[PDB]
Ligand binder design. Structure first.
Ligand SMILES: [Rb+]
Ligand SMILES: [Rb+]
Ligand SMILES: [Rb+]
Ligand SMILES: [Rb+]
Ligand SMILES: [Rb+]
Ligand SMILES: [Rb+]
Ligand SMILES: [Rb+]
Ligand SMILES: [Rb+]
Ligand SMILES: [Rb+]
Ligand SMILES: [Rb+]
Ligand SMILES: [Rb+]
Ligand SMILES: [Rb+]
Ligand SMILES: [Rb+]
Ligand SMILES: [Rb+]
Ligand SMILES: [Rb+]
Ligand SMILES: [Rb+]
Ligand SMILES: [Rb+]
Ligand SMILES: [Rb+]
Ligand SMILES: [Rb+]
Ligand SMILES: [Rb+]
Ligand SMILES: [Rb+]
Ligand SMILES: [Rb+]
Ligand SMILES: [Rb+]
Ligand SMILES: [Rb+]
Ligand SMILES: [Rb+]
Ligand SMILES: [Rb+]
Ligand SMILES: [Rb+]
Ligand SMILES: [Rb+]
Ligand SMILES: [Rb+]
Ligand SMILES: [Rb+]
Ligand SMILES: [Rb+]
Ligand SMILES: [Rb+]
Ligand SMILES: [Rb+]
Ligand SMILES: [Rb+]
Ligand SMILES: [Rb+]
Ligand SMILES: [Rb+]
Ligand SMILES: [Rb+]
Ligand SMILES: [Rb+]
Ligand SMILES: [Rb+]
Lengths: 340, 340, 340
């Protein structure tokens, strides 16, 4: 909610309380998302300052607070900064910003990431360009310098983040995304290539010095109808873990298919029908294995713009044969959300 | 403080800075609350949205920030999310909410929890129903569906939270609290029963598959006078630690007595006289031992609704003989508080 | 930004998003500040309540959120509470506050701490009186009880903070700072003495039961010109680490020299020219070694009061001979900042 607007500067302090619970077979040990309490709260701000007639400065921060944790020693599990960036926009020239932000491949993967709780599994956090990453300088353009309306292109420069784990580590890289929108329809083509750290190559799973991520996207967003389709492939980028041998690393090749179909009713009901298939290739000692495979059936109910309730059910298509050890059981998520 | 109120939605961002210090014999090693710096700050929001004529949606989050910590490695000690929940209320039918919230036994124990700093020791955090817990769905009713004014009943459903420590672990359970208020007077009767996890049974202290918590409460809150009385008993629920054998677990039986007497002066002075007795029974290898035993003498001074200063002194009645090893020395707490 | 002002109470919720990056030789292993991503975000509040005609209550909290971290296990590195205090001011008598706050020696060292990114190395955090510390009760006076305008004196009482590390540990102590300001000019003389904990004496580096910190300061702050000069000496107080023997402790004697020269242009440009020399003496097994030695050349550009960009370059004067093992390579920092 916008809480400040005075002398050429506006502040929008936003947040949400999500009373979330997961339902699965067993103790959520071998399911799609686990079971039990998954309550979380959000807090952050969106800032914008009118510098002059056609130049604006901005700054955004977002944090994830967890409510499913105790007040004891485990009081800080899953607590992280999601967004933290500042930048400038100069009319019909472009926008530049530095700080923790979504990658440029998410410009294509954000098409199918509209499900009540789950969906968009390929948009991993701290994974080069598919999700929220550090060391990123993003240039974004709207309407091609104010010449061709709808045509939007973006370029990003990923910096090296040598961390304790190879899962969260990355090298230097450049990404891009081209998009055009015309009367409901929208087509996106994103690509991102980056170097891999020495710790990433040291892992038992995954072999290669270079990491590549690309995704395409077609959608229709007009008259209460949302239909989305994503197809993408990653090279030495998708984070994978073997539950049998207790080994971590990356998948050499993945085919990622996302399909989403939603309708928004006038009385405030959004049923959601989706499909997700993500299969890996050339896994060390394994070969070809399905990482993510399911059908999504859900429904979201908005009371207004502030209060909402949703039930998100996933029909897990992953077999018990899975050579890596991915959860095969179904996961039902019911959540009540207040937001401001 | 309420910072937003527009189109059927209001946001109340609240918080406080508590400049707190503890005084005790030694290095607070063997006292009621320890000694030294205990400065802490709070931050959170209270939200409410007017959905229609007689339906309201809400969402609340609360966090505890610690100021008595360094900026080094110990920069996150005692930092936790206290509240994180969202829910709906529909006029004279009831109110339902899910997310981290106080248990239903606190509806009775909150009667005597009005002391400047200490008091309400039996209202432990992450302990089934006596305090703030996870996995709770609470239904609350006011004026018995709008028929019998003053009569308030509530039901809660505690979910299983299998954690790293048995202290913070709990199973599935159901709780309840019945209350009636009439011209200053108020009588409460709360009860809560829940299952115990395998880690809780594995502890050297405490034996039993079921955990029970019940408490009664009588008070008078009229014309600047606050008199409160609590009596409760727990079954395999009260968290206890043996300082001699270095063992943790739960007490099989506890008798909990709370007495509070306060007056609010017109010039802004609230003296506080209280008594607390909590004795354990059937402790493994010990038997009967006093957990909490003291007299409280304190005073709170409100400058206004925002600024306050208080001195809270506890006369510890616990002997040095204590077979478990509970602190016997007195603890004096002086704190200066700003709140908004 | 001030977001609340009603019935004798005002709340100022402030924060900033700093898109910061560091440039150095190698992997920032042997430089002045390191290299890579250093993005951070801030959040806090400034409160003030009008109690009566000439008495005001206040409360301030400040937190540092890090954006250069992952969402995984390292999601809470460098996250700390910087400020957390509440206090009272009574017209021309003085101001008293308790809670985490800057030390009284920073009243002199804050003179040269005006550089775009770096500078003020002698103002260490959790170090007795030079920076932000715990267990501090500060009395501050303005215009000498309203008699001699410009003359400001302050007294502080540091409490003992026995922590896990000797670096962040301190004992009981008293500090003071006397200052006078007259038409741009300002002269400050600060002093602070405190006891050392048993863990601080147990360290291989540093020998002495008492810790002393004093600093002087001359400045000119008038007509877009800022010229500052600091000189100070510490006794068993300055935290030092030997990179060769892997030992930590304190320096017995340090000579601290700070020089700053800045001009503020009318179109919004602030070039910064600074000098810093901090040499240690009587180091255990070493003797005399330079801790901090460099020239600062930088520039800050304010678009307005909310948006800013700066480039801060340090010319590291420290040799590779350094017997302790302090970074010798240069560090270039470029940052884009939004604030509200
Ligand atoms: Rb189930
Ligand atoms: Rb686990
Ligand atoms: Rb611990
Ligand atoms: Rb821990
Ligand atoms: Rb988003
Ligand atoms: Rb949705
Ligand atoms: Rb970044
Ligand atoms: Rb970087
Ligand atoms: Rb490999
Ligand atoms: Rb909906
Ligand atoms: Rb498979
Ligand atoms: Rb709606
Ligand atoms: Rb299945
Ligand atoms: Rb004492
Ligand atoms: Rb301890
Ligand atoms: Rb550390
Ligand atoms: Rb730690
Ligand atoms: Rb309360
Ligand atoms: Rb009180
Ligand atoms: Rb919960
Ligand atoms: Rb649960
Ligand atoms: Rb037992
Ligand atoms: Rb009072
Ligand atoms: Rb006893
Ligand atoms: Rb009052
Ligand atoms: Rb005693
Ligand atoms: Rb460089
Ligand atoms: Rb390091
Ligand atoms: Rb971990
Ligand atoms: Rb960790
Ligand atoms: Rb400052
Ligand atoms: Rb500056
Ligand atoms: Rb303090
Ligand atoms: Rb202290
Ligand atoms: Rb020593
Ligand atoms: Rb400037
Ligand atoms: Rb040297
Ligand atoms: Rb300016
Ligand atoms: Rb050099």
């Amino acid at each position: 909610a916008e809480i400040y607007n005075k002398d050429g500067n506006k502040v929008d302090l936003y947040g949400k309380a999500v009373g979330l619970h997961y339902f699965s077979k067993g103790n959520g040990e071998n399911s799609y998302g686990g079971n039990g309490d998954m309550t979380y709260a959000r807090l952050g701000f969106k800032g914008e300052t009118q510098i002059n007639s056609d130049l604006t400065g901005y700054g955004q921060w977002e944090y994830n607070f967890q409510g499913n944790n105790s007040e004891g020693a485990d009081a800080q599990t899953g607590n992280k900064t999601r967004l933290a960036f500042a930048g400038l926009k100069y009319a019909d020239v472009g926008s530049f910003d530095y700080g923790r932000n979504y990658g440029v491949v998410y410009d294509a993967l954000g098409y199918t990431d509209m499900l009540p709780e789950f969906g968009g599994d390929t948009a991993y956090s701290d994974d080069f360009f598919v999700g929220r990453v550090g060391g990123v300088a993003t240039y974004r353009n709207s309407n091609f310098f104010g010449l061709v309306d709808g045509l939007n292109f973006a370029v990003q420069y990923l910096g090296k983040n040598e961390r304790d784990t190879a899962r969260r580590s990355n090298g230097d890289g450049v990404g891009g995304s081209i998009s055009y929108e015309y009367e409901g329809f929208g087509i996106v083509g994103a690509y991102g290539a980056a170097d891999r750290t020495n710790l990433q190559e040291a892992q038992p799973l995954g072999n290669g010095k270079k990491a590549e991520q690309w995704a395409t996207g077609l959608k229709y967003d007009a008259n209460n109808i949302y239909l989305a389709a994503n197809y993408g492939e990653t090279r030495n980028a998708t984070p994978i873990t073997n539950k049998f041998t207790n080994t971590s690393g990356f998948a050499n090749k993945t085919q990622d298919v996302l399909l989403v179909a939603q309708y928004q009713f006038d009385f405030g009901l959004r049923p959601s029908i989706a499909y997700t298939k993500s299969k890996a290739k050339d896994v060390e000692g394994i070969g070809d294995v399905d990482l993510v495979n399911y059908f999504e059936v859900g429904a979201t109910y908005y009371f207004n713009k502030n209060m909402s309730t949703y039930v998100d059910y996933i029909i897990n298509q992953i077999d018990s044969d899975n050579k890596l050890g991915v959860g095969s059981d179904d996961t039902v998520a019911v959540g009540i959300v207040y937001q401001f």
